[PDB]
């Protein structure tokens, strides 16, 4: 029993964290084999942020201009290149602690673990979600650029996020590991802001199934609804449209609890229209939406790796 | 910016997790140097749980009766002993990944990270607190016995919890690393239940300071109260008494935000008497109490290790 915001074990990733210094700027880098990945704005200067030309800034740099420290060892840079908004520094040494890994670009609504770092040293690990508006509600301070987000699917680390910026509202924006930003954001000083967000409906439903698995049943009812009548109520409460694909993904959780997906949707409509009335669900007074169906199965069945 | 339930990086602990098998029972063990620690009820049989005599059960066991698997390597047991409710199996090999470590027995209200494991393999990491009633609200399934809780204070791992049981209400109970249970619980089948719990007041106040640090100010007021008048309101809402020591611990957070502790207490009294009125604090509609003052400073200042 129990349900927590559970992050993946971080050790496989900790062994890859390094420190990259260019001039006065210092941030974190990801050391995989003999390449170090980090945000390309480590090359910028604070006075040249309105519109930096990254190709020009990079041709004027040399291999000795990058200080890469891995713990108590300095790494020698033997080459550099740029891929979208990430900088790739080839080093003369391959990381012996390199895990089995992939680079994945995830969809909004999926979750990952963040290993926040400062000066190459891991500080903490937490779970978060890619919001529908392609921001993340992380916990980041100055120096955390280059921290990565990741998932694990057996022994393979799937990296999916590298941290680049904090927007004015305090949320965060960054790229996949091939340097493509999530959302319409760019690594330059503009008036860009996070758009309006919505609630990840399929995730709320999974978290409701997680509650049933753990003994919370006060919110269920005898009713059922259609996909159309539910999406009409969802859109009124700023919820993501629920697709038939979502209903299919919620299949295994529906069979484990014997509650049909459209039956669970009727409970959700009631909860949106009437609130919780002083009651809580899995220790929350709000409808949580940062648990994917896979997260629920992972925690309520107990898969390792 | 941002505030998350942040766990410590788990890698130092992952390298110590093993699998211990005695007869048909299998649970997790903690491999530090040449000793493997695990719950002593791994020696029991399912039919002899009403009142097992652990001294008798242990004299009838031999070194070959314990199977200790560390990954894809079997460890040879060269001795066994019992310390309170933990079993200590000396192995012929010292763990090369043994970190710098201590064993600490923590106070109710303190937090730690849990690395949940099954069959020796880490599954996930989450934060939790020792409740005033000496239970923890963890996330544990069959096979998670032997998972440990821990803190990090530089490069030293301070182990403080080993998981033993899940009580009827779904909360969990276990021991420190020297085998002494937290609370009045015992590793035998009785009618024991978790006592009535209270809210960790000093932790709520720290989490309120964390909110101010992150831009949430709607709950502040101009008022102040005394320690006595506040504790009179706290006891009415089933909150832990606030001591002068607590007020001293909240010192640095009070100086960073310029809000006096007794001023923050006046905000808390108002929030208890009137609720939140549809508003949230740091993304919660409830008053969170699983953040210690040190956790807040760690996340809002960014210490690593
Ligand atoms: C000084 C050379 C260029 C400059 N490089 C950094 O400044 C920087 C350096 C090292 C670690 C860093 N760690 C962080 C950081 C991470 N997460 C949360 C935070 C919260 C508060 C303060 C800082 C952070 N930054 C800052 C750059 C990023 C930003 O959004 N600028 C508008 C935040 C770091 C930069 C300016 C503007 C941008 C823009 F694209 F947003 F405009 C990007 C980079
Ligand atoms: C079979 C030999 C003895 C027996 N040994 C185990 O049974 C056991 C074995 C391996 C991994 C285990 N992992 C778990 C487990 C951990 N966390 C959450 C869980 C949630 C649901 C189910 C199981 C768990 N257990 C169970 C023993 C503990 C308990 O409270 N019994 C009343 C839970 C494990 C045992 C019975 C009673 C007690 C008592 F002291 F509570 F009475 C203790 C142990």
Author numbering:
A (entry chain B), B (entry chain B): 1 to 305
Question: What is written in the article reporting this PDB entry?
Answer:
The SARS-CoV-2 main protease (Mpro) is a cysteine protease that induces scission at 11 sites within polyproteins ppla and pplab, and its inhibition blocks the liberation and maturation of proteins required for viral propagation. The active site of Mpro contains four subsites (S1’, S1, S2, S3) that accommodate the amino acids of the peptide substrate (P1’, P1, P2, and P3). The Mpro enzyme has a stringent requirement for glutamine in the P1 position, which occupies the S1 subsite. An affinity selection of a 4-billion-membered DNA-encoded chemical library (DECL) using Mpro as bait produces novel non-covalent and non-peptide-based small molecule inhibitors of Mpro with low nanomolar Ki values.
In contrast, it was discovered that CDD-1733, harboring the S-configuration, gave a Ki of 12 nM. The 2.14 Å resolution structure from space group C121 has a single monomer in the asymmetric unit, and the biological dimer is formed by the monomer and the symmetry-related monomer across the crystallographic two-fold axis. The structure shows CDD-1733 within the active site where enzyme binding is driven by direct and water-mediated hydrogen bonds and the hydrophobic effect. Hydrophobic effects lead to contacts between the isoquinoline unit and other S1 residues including Phe140, Leu141, and Asn142. The six-membered ring of the hydrophobic benzimidazole extends into the S1’ subsite, where it makes contact with Thr25 and Leu27.
